[PDB]
Amino acid sequence: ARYTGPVTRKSRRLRTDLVGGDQAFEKRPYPPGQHGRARIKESEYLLQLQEKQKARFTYGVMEKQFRRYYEEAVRQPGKTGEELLKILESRLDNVIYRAGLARTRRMARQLVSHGHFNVNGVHVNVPSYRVSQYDIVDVRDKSLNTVPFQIARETAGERPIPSWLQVVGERQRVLIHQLPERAQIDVPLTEQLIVEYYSK
Amino acid sequence: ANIKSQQKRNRTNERARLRNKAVKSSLRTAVRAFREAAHAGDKAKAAELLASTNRKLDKAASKGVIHKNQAANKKSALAQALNKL
Amino acid sequence: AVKIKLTRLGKIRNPQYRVAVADARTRRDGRAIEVIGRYHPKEEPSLIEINSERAQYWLSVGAQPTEPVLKLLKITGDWQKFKGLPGAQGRLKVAAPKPSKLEVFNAALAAAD
RNA sequence: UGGAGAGUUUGAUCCUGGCUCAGGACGAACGCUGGCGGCGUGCUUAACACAUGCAAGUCGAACGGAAAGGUCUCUUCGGAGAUACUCGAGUGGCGAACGGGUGAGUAACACGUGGGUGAUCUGCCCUGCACUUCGGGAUAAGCCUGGGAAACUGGGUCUAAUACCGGAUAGGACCACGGGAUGCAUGUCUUGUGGUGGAAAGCGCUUUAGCGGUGUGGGAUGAGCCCGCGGCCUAUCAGCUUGUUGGUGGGGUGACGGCCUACCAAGGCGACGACGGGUAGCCGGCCUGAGAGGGUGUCCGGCCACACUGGGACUGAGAUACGGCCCAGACUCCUACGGGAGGCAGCAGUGGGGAAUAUUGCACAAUGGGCGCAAGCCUGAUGCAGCGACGCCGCGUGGGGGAUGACGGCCUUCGGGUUGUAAACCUCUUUCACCAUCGACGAAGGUCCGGGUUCUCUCGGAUUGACGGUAGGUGGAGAAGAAGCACCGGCCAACUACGUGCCAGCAGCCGCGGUAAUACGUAGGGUGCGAGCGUUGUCCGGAAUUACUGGGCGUAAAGAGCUCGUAGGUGGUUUGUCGCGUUGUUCGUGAAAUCUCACGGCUUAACUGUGAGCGUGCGGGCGAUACGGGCAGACUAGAGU
Ligand SMILES: [Mg+2]
Ligand SMILES: [Mg+2]
Ligand SMILES: [Mg+2]
Ligand SMILES: [Mg+2]
Ligand SMILES: [Mg+2]
Ligand SMILES: [Mg+2]
Ligand SMILES: [Mg+2]
Ligand SMILES: [Mg+2]
Ligand SMILES: [Mg+2]
Ligand SMILES: [Mg+2]
Ligand SMILES: [Mg+2]
Ligand SMILES: [Mg+2]
Ligand SMILES: [Mg+2]
Ligand SMILES: [Mg+2]
Ligand SMILES: [Mg+2]
Ligand SMILES: [Mg+2]
Ligand SMILES: [Mg+2]
Ligand SMILES: [Mg+2]
Ligand SMILES: [Mg+2]
Ligand SMILES: [Mg+2]
Ligand SMILES: [Mg+2]
Ligand SMILES: [Mg+2]
Ligand SMILES: [Mg+2]
Ligand SMILES: [Mg+2]
Ligand SMILES: [Mg+2]
Ligand SMILES: [Mg+2]
Ligand SMILES: [Mg+2]
Ligand SMILES: [Mg+2]
Ligand SMILES: [Mg+2]
Ligand SMILES: [Mg+2]
Ligand SMILES: [Mg+2]
Ligand SMILES: [Mg+2]
Ligand SMILES: [Mg+2]
Ligand SMILES: [Mg+2]
Ligand SMILES: [Mg+2]
Ligand SMILES: [Mg+2]
Ligand SMILES: [Mg+2]
Ligand SMILES: [Mg+2]
Ligand SMILES: [Mg+2]
Ligand SMILES: [Mg+2]
Ligand SMILES: [Mg+2]
Ligand SMILES: [Mg+2]
Ligand SMILES: [Mg+2]
Ligand SMILES: [Mg+2]
Ligand SMILES: [Mg+2]
Ligand SMILES: [Mg+2]
Ligand SMILES: [Mg+2]
Ligand SMILES: [Mg+2]
Ligand SMILES: [Mg+2]
Ligand SMILES: [Mg+2]
Ligand SMILES: [Mg+2]
Ligand SMILES: [Mg+2]
Ligand SMILES: [Mg+2]
């Protein structure tokens, strides 16, 4: 399922601007509710829970699905926070976001959901399609000459392209050189606290 | 019985029972007449009922009445019961 | 008798088969004596492999193939080389090699630049 | 590559030590709620009683025949000829011992793993080899009649066969004597002379269609029997055993064997738990755990045991003989009262028990099986569909802007705050359901018609799919059809107001409530989660609270009142040997699924396929001798005189 609710309210409580830029946030950067102004209690469980609540509502992933991502991140060799966002950055609606073919995280999900993208000439409509190395992500034939797609042609400058993917020109097709390691991830969250949450 | 091919086979089992009962019962008398000859100590009839009892044991083994290993057990017992005399 | 048969072990609508030297008095997915190949009747040609030096062992000692396995041993040339037929070569056809994951990716670079 | 703690004994503290909670899981049930799809899965209790339909047949290329269909001819205007394609009933062949189900019984060689069989069997299949030869008397069916209420049954005539019966010759049947190879004691295999013996079957052809028969050497498969080792509770069960333990002579069996029997001998088992009681199908695996362990045996896969209860056999290569037989017992139904018939723990289904578990579905298209030369027929195996959120996984319920922070709601130190960019409005996109429309892969096959001789093989066509007019593709209209549930004193994320005043009631802990309750009931707000959320039950974790990994005993639970001593456990110094323990290597095995790793296919994922690991072990070969042990010695420090 999907949350489909107020996006500022679950960015006030976590005390971090989740969606990129907000004027509703930073007018009230304190948590919501009628008791929203009093100070909080510094618990060790709260600092590990609200670090995982960052990673869910940043990406729009539910708890039974996000828990499965931990179960294989802890199982691959290397580290655990490194491979948690590695299999989270490679979701298709996150690839469409970082390529600049949308504005927010929710609209980058409907464009994958409502059938506006092929990958290898294969009509996908799943948001959690994990791309791999060398996966071209093309765009449909009917998807051109449409209002919410050619808004993403003259707005190709205000956010940078990460070093692991590469967008090309008038054919909007996203090419993946390798999986993102650590440094080309946008970081609003620290990664050694989700790992310490599921070990409880 | 209920299946059509089991009423058919209940009759063919009863013929083969009456057929095998008569053949096996003939071997018990032909063994006995050798026993009543060799225990008396003749060496004359027992040497010529050994040839006729062993010849019936081989014929029942080819008619599918006793087994070929059963014929070989009873012939070796009676032939060794001749050489004791 | 000893039957060379097929064993259904895929998903619900995807019948991936194996080729198993089994016994006649045995259900499909029982103990095989030697699994010697697989048969996948969902690809565009199909996917057929027979070991071809152990299928020559079981045919030379008395195994009886079932009627879709008899079609398969004629395709891979293992039936004909046991009898003495002229068709001892393989009339089996494999799928065409699609352009791989790297060669299409590099060709999409030079088409945009 | 993987180990978290917290509350509660006291006025306070440190220990000991219980109890309780936060995690995961389920063949679940229950409460509230409910959109869809993929894929799994569903009588855990009464191995309780079962209405109805179906779940094993096939062969005319084994045989006599002609009830049905189709013809040639003939007559009557509905009778003939089996000779004639075809075929009801009947004889014969093979199958019916597999496939499916259940877990009552079994503490056992039942199962797991590894060996043995010089102690054995093995239909159909493959292959080497010899052979297929003389004859004989019947009966089912048919027809005519007798008995019985039925189920069934008697008698007389009459016809076959690859049915049945008797001879001929044919070594792996036997007896005695040898030879040559072998070893592991009985012995085993290969051979020689002499003496006794044992088989069978024919049918079909558009004329090279084609199918078969018997005896034997050797393979393949399936099975039997025996042994090492391993996997529960109980000593408030300590004497069990007389065919018991061993021998000889016979009987028996496919085979060894007290398996059976006669006689002789006096043994066998047991504190390393015999005899007894309780419980239980076992295993791969499953759930948990860092691991070692602990609980379990459900889907799927291997094995065992049983088929209304108890017993017995027959047939056969093969029998716990579910849908066979006979007998006794209990229960249901028929009867003319003499007698008869019946077994869902097959597939659906009904009653009952229960907190609880589904359709009297479709189809042989696929794969597997039975018979047949083959075409085909049979297959409730199976392939799929129906129903239940029962579980896992995936996706939706909108998105981008947007303060006049509107009304309303609750709180307010009456200034405001908050629900809240959330709605309003503007604008954009249609995944799913919805309407219309094209429409499969599963089918390099199964059959008929042409080239190919044959077998085989494409050039090449006809028709053939239960799922299914489904999955998926295309097009249409509009944000349009779609969110809940528990919790908010601490553990434990997340607080105020009003109502209620030891009342009503809450709670897992210990506590809360006695007129300002963050702990009870409502409302606003929050938080977790999401088509689910909570509760109850059960199991593991935390529990280093059974401690091998990994604890203790002066005073916390804990040293027998003290010694002597049997079984047992452990052993100083040193030389040589053996290679059982230990250790190295190599081969065989540790089935497939599952599990971890790497990639591939379903739009991804769950699911699935492939390769490598894992499979801790066990068996055979060949190395090592430091340590433990065995064997043969030595020494004097321990011990004793
Ligand atoms: Mg879900
Ligand atoms: Mg018959
Ligand atoms: Mg008599
Ligand atoms: Mg004997
Ligand atoms: Mg005290
Ligand atoms: Mg106190
Ligand atoms: Mg429910
Ligand atoms: Mg309901
Ligand atoms: Mg279903
Ligand atoms: Mg049951
Ligand atoms: Mg019953
Ligand atoms: Mg007939
Ligand atoms: Mg036949
Ligand atoms: Mg059976
Ligand atoms: Mg069951
Ligand atoms: Mg006659
Ligand atoms: Mg002769
Ligand atoms: Mg004869
Ligand atoms: Mg006695
Ligand atoms: Mg004896
Ligand atoms: Mg004896
Ligand atoms: Mg039981
Ligand atoms: Mg532990
Ligand atoms: Mg089972
Ligand atoms: Mg017999
Ligand atoms: Mg039967
Ligand atoms: Mg039955
Ligand atoms: Mg049933
Ligand atoms: Mg009831
Ligand atoms: Mg079929
Ligand atoms: Mg078939
Ligand atoms: Mg469902
Ligand atoms: Mg569409
Ligand atoms: Mg708290
Ligand atoms: Mg009050
Ligand atoms: Mg309350
Ligand atoms: Mg509970
Ligand atoms: Mg516990
Ligand atoms: Mg423990
Ligand atoms: Mg202690
Ligand atoms: Mg002590
Ligand atoms: Mg005291
Ligand atoms: Mg004490
Ligand atoms: Mg003392
Ligand atoms: Mg001692
Ligand atoms: Mg010792
Ligand atoms: Mg020593
Ligand atoms: Mg993979
Ligand atoms: Mg993939
Ligand atoms: Mg797998
Ligand atoms: Mg395995
Ligand atoms: Mg070894
Ligand atoms: Mg001294």
From Swiss-Prot, chain A:
Annotated SMART domains: Ribosomal_S4, S4
Domain (S4 RNA-binding): residue spans on this chain: 90-156
GO molecular function: rRNA binding; structural constituent of ribosome
CDD domains with a match to the protein in the record: S4 (cd00165)
Keywords assigned by UniProt, alphabetized: Ribonucleoprotein, Ribosomal protein, RNA-binding, rRNA-binding
GO CC, one annotated term: small ribosomal subunit
The organism's place on the tree of life at top rank: Bacteria
One of the GO biological process terms: ribosomal small subunit biogenesis
Tagged with keyword RNA-binding: yes
Subunit record text: Part of the 30S ribosomal subunit. Contacts protein S5. The interaction surface between S4 and S5 is involved in control of translational fidelity.
Family, similarity comment: Belongs to the universal ribosomal protein uS4 family.
Function comment: One of the primary rRNA binding proteins, it binds directly to 16S rRNA where it nucleates assembly of the body of the 30S subunit. With S5 and S12 plays an important role in translational accuracy.
Extra remark: Was identified as a high-confidence drug target.
Annotated protein name in UniProt: Small ribosomal subunit protein uS4
Species: Mycobacterium tuberculosis (strain ATCC 25618 / H37Rv)
Swiss-Prot record, chain B:
Start and end residues of each stretch annotated as Disordered: 1-24
Keywords: Ribonucleoprotein, Ribosomal protein, RNA-binding, rRNA-binding
Domain of life of the native organism: Bacteria
RNA-binding in keyword set: yes
Coiled-coil regions listed: none
A GO term from the CC aspect: small ribosomal subunit
GO terms of molecular function: small ribosomal subunit rRNA binding; structural constituent of ribosome
Gene Ontology biological-process annotations: translation
Similarity section: Belongs to the bacterial ribosomal protein bS20 family.
Reported function: Binds directly to 16S ribosomal RNA.
PANTHER family: 30S RIBOSOMAL PROTEIN S20, SMALL RIBOSOMAL SUBUNIT PROTEIN BS20C
Any further remark recorded for this protein: Was identified as a high-confidence drug target.
Protein name stated in the entry: Small ribosomal subunit protein bS20
From Swiss-Prot, chain C:
GO MF, one example: structural constituent of ribosome
Signal peptide (from-to): none
Keywords for this protein: Ribonucleoprotein, Ribosomal protein
One of the record's GO cellular component terms: cytoplasm
Keyword Cytoplasm: no
Superkingdom as given in the UniProt entry: Bacteria
GO biological process, one term: translation
Protein family per UniProt: Belongs to the bacterial ribosomal protein bS16 family.
Protein name: Small ribosomal subunit protein bS16
Organism listed in the record: Mycobacterium tuberculosis (strain ATCC 25618 / H37Rv)
